[PDB]
Amino acid sequence: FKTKGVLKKRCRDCYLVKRRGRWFIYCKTNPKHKQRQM
Amino acid sequence: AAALARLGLRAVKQVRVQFCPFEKNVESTRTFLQAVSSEKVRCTNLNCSVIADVRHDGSEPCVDVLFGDGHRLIMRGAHLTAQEMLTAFASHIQARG
Amino acid sequence: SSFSKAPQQWATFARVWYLLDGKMQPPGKLAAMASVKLQGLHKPVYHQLSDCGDHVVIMNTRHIAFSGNKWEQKVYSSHTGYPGGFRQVTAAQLHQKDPVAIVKLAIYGMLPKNLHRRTMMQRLHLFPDEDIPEDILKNLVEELPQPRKVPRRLDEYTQEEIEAFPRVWSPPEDYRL
Amino acid sequence: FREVVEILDGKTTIIEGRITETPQESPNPPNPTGQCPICRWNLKHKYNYEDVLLLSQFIRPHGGMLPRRITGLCQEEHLKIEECVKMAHRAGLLPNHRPKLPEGFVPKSKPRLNRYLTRWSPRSVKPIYNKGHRWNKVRMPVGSPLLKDNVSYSGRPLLLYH
Amino acid sequence: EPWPIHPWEPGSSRVGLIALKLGMMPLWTKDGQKHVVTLLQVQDCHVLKYTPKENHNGRMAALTVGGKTVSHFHKSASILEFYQELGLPPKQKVKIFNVTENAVIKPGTPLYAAHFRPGQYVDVTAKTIGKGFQGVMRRWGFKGQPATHGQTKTHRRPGAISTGDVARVWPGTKMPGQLGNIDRTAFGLKVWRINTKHNIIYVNGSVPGHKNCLVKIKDSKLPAYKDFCKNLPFPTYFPDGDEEALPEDLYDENVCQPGAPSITFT
Amino acid sequence: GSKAVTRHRRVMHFERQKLMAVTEYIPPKPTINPRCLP
RNA sequence: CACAAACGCGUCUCAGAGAUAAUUAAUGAUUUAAUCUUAACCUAAUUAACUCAUAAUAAAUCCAGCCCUAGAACAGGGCACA
RNA sequence: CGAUGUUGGAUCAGGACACCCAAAUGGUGCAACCGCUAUUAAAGGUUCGUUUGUUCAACGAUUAAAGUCCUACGUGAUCUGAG
Ligand SMILES: [Mg+2]
Ligand SMILES: [Mg+2]
Ligand SMILES: [Mg+2]
Ligand SMILES: [Mg+2]
Ligand SMILES: [Mg+2]
Ligand SMILES: [Mg+2]
Ligand SMILES: [Mg+2]
Ligand SMILES: [Mg+2]
Ligand SMILES: [Mg+2]
Ligand SMILES: [Mg+2]
Ligand SMILES: [Mg+2]
Ligand SMILES: [Mg+2]
Ligand SMILES: [Mg+2]
Ligand SMILES: [Mg+2]
Ligand SMILES: [Mg+2]
Ligand SMILES: [Mg+2]
Ligand SMILES: [Mg+2]
Ligand SMILES: [Mg+2]
Ligand SMILES: [Mg+2]
Ligand SMILES: [Mg+2]
Ligand SMILES: [Mg+2]
Ligand SMILES: [Mg+2]
Ligand SMILES: [Mg+2]
Ligand SMILES: [Zn+2]
Ligand SMILES: [Zn+2]
């Protein structure tokens, strides 16, 4: 996970989900694409 | 089609879809037949026998799946949606077999 | 009207016991009217120097309701005085520890900041449930109305009202819920 | 309404789709020319979170909302009704619209805290430890900004942040 | 007329004793180690009054226990009247024990050192040795200033006591004052030996308080020794019930008894 | 004393703040919303 | 250690439950698929704090004098076995 | 400026988290051990010595680590006066 102010999908498999009050880029094929909105 | 392809239909013997095209509630069954008789489903298992029975007076579209567990899954689809039928068939395949 | 001086004085300045049900009521709206009654601002004979102040008995304190996310957002901060002794407890945790605490703090905050605040707080009785001692119960005069009208849940609705309310839309027959 | 029933007998499964009678729309809508259900029944800017008799007309038996393409609402009314359903569910209204779990209903937990007009999810809000001074005050949101257009008889605007 | 005796329960709590700290004695274990034990002598321990659970705490009942006898001529009228109604001579130390409702004992019942058994853990509460108004160096272990490198009249002062900006000293400041005459409890002291003839308990380690002081002893409340009350006499020890005298000395399974084959290693 | 052109938005006088608040734009609002009107 | 004591360099003891943040998954609508949910329902694995079990104190109106391992004074414990 | 007495050190430290250790995790060009980053957490710790008045700095031996700062560059009606 990387904490960022702007979330962008780095591939076609990234999906954006709202959890715990924040926005998240979750990725299963590339786990390094995990982003968390600060 | 992709959902069935990613399921490993190697353990299915015969699938027969019997329907009447001139009815008004066979669209879901026809879509199910198209999804289950796709190229990927054909290539994921070759010994499976897919049959499409066409009637005019039956007025009851139904599907029958016989597979080598000695198991018979019969679904008489008159109001069932195609997506629900596919999900139920996939769940049963991944459960038994 | 033709009372003697002493009984007229006693009647005019007599203390009154009020009841207040706090079930599903906002603690702030409870505390505003409780503080009004405690100060005596509901008496035309009220004065700051006079000791005109009535008793308020609040029941069902454990069943108060906070509007919005105040249960998890509102915090209460205390300091024991010793270094490192600053505690900030959430409203839900404080309610779990002590049901009386939330409404007690609300009334204490809404009361005036003079030395009479302690004296008129001694005249406030808070009970977590409808378990009031008979000594206090025999003193009650009237029960004040609840400031908030509690809405009724769906299964509490009468079948007559349910069928009377119209169907704003017609769902399709083939749809599956 | 449609239901799916499953029958198991001798390692054979049969699923059947049964259609039962469903209620229809009331014969006389006050504004029949409206293209939208709420906006033709004249409930626009008229319902709140506590109007369960209207909010439960179109929600799934397990509390989920119904799709807009099925209900027929305009987008703003659909969003308002979804927010109202969320607020009612959090407040405790609609108690029969939850899934049944006999195994989980036995281990009772701490008593539920009474609440209403709750905007956020109860498990997603962090306590405001700082709370700010008068010039920079951290306000607690109450209700939803989607319902700020509701009719106000007293004339005072709704305090959505307090 | 004894009160009914209830069976032991997993969440039961026993009454305690009020003994006298006699002294300290060496003791040896069969593995060769040497421990030091404290002698707690139960001189005259009695149950004085009983208080119901709902009237005392709402969770456990309270049993009042009195220690060694004192003179009638130096007690107050109320205390003398209470002991006259009870039927016992006045006691020096009076303590309250939180017990469960099934372990209650009738007031006036005596208690003996056989209430505890060799191999057990106990809690010992007593007033520690009072050292009076002590300096900060001995009260809190503060390091002093250097001795001779130029320091003027500061060899034992606490030094700085607060911070300049605070403009006050915090309530938790460590400063010279009283040290010692306060109640302290030692937890988990092992019982090695019980002398029934003299009613003396051999408790492992040290015991707070000076010698010949009244000591409140009870079962250990540590979670590691919660359920050792099962094998012990639950209500209390009754010497007149078993109709068979206990041995003069009851030892633990590892205590080197005075009469020993002078253990040699193999 | 700040210059006429700054980088910190150069907070205004209270009278000017009230003037801007009063003169804030008010968009027209139709009597009936036309989305799902006929 | 030339006081009966003090003392370390010497000896003894040191604990259960809840709770969480980040982060994992189960069921499942808006979006009849999926989706840990600023969607409800019960969910489980989970830091340090922090509270609470639990522990200590917790018998009022005798106090002249004399001792004390109690104490600056005041206080506090003893003065029937001997 | 009809006086707010200074560096450093001794004693005692209060606090912040922008965490050095200890604790729970995400990603690694993460095979394991070592590592590199980021998230959450401040109840508790964060050594002894040679030179230098030294804060710093170099060096020796270790540690789970020898954190960055604020506190009148904390603290001289508590101490030193090496500068
Ligand atoms: Mg002394
Ligand atoms: Mg020294
Ligand atoms: Mg000098
Ligand atoms: Mg000197
Ligand atoms: Mg001098
Ligand atoms: Mg000050
Ligand atoms: Mg200017
Ligand atoms: Mg689903
Ligand atoms: Mg998944
Ligand atoms: Mg406690
Ligand atoms: Mg005395
Ligand atoms: Mg000057
Ligand atoms: Mg001056
Ligand atoms: Mg410190
Ligand atoms: Mg942090
Ligand atoms: Mg670490
Ligand atoms: Mg620290
Ligand atoms: Mg500076
Ligand atoms: Mg300074
Ligand atoms: Mg100073
Ligand atoms: Mg200095
Ligand atoms: Mg000086
Ligand atoms: Mg000089
Ligand atoms: Zn990706
Ligand atoms: Zn509409």
Which chain pair shows the most residues in contact?
A: C-D, 40 and 56 residues
Provide the CATH topology of chain C. Answer: Ribosomal Protein L13p, Chain: A
User: How large is the share of residues in beta strands of chain C?
Assistant: 15-25%
| Spatial gap, N to C terminus of chain C | 71 Å
Order of strands, main sheet of chain C, comes to 6-2-1-7
Order of helices and strands of chain D: EEHHHHHE
Overall number of strands of chain C? 7
What would you say the CATH architecture of chain C is? Alpha-Beta Complex
Measured as a percent range, the helix fraction of chain D is 10-25%
Domains of chain D, number: 1
What small molecules does the structure contain? magnesium ion, zinc ion
- Read across the widest sheet of chain D, the strand sequence of neighbours is 1-2
**Number of distinct beta strands of chain D:** 3
Give a short account of the largest sheet of chain C.
4 strands, parallel
Number of domains of chain C: 1
The succession of helices and strands of chain C, N to C, reads: HEHEEHEEHHHEHEH
Number of helices of chain D: 5
Q: State the shape of chain C.
A: flat
Give the helix/strand layout:
This is part of a larger assembly, with chains A (38 residues), B (97 residues), C (177 residues), D (162 residues), E (266 residues) and F (38 residues).
Chain C: H1 5-12, E1 17-21, H2 27-39, E2 55-59, E3 65-67, H3 70-73, E4 75-79, E5 86-90, H4 91-97, H5 99-110, H6 116-121, E6 124-126, H7 134-137, E7 140-143, H8 159-164
Parallel strand pairs in C: 1-2, 1-7, 2-6
Antiparallel strand pairs in C: 4-5
Helix pairs in contact in C: 2-5, 4-5
Chain D: E1 2-8, E2 12-19, H1 37-41, H2 52-55, H3 68-71, H4 75-91, H5 102-105, E3 114-116
Antiparallel strand pairs in D: 1-2
Chain F: H1 14-22
The structure holds magnesium ion (23 copies) and zinc ion (2 copies).
The structure holds 2 RNA strands.
Organism (chain E): Sus scrofa (Pig)
Keywords (chain E): Metal-binding, Mitochondrion, Ribonucleoprotein, Ribosomal protein, Transit peptide
GO molecular function, one term (chain E): structural constituent of ribosome
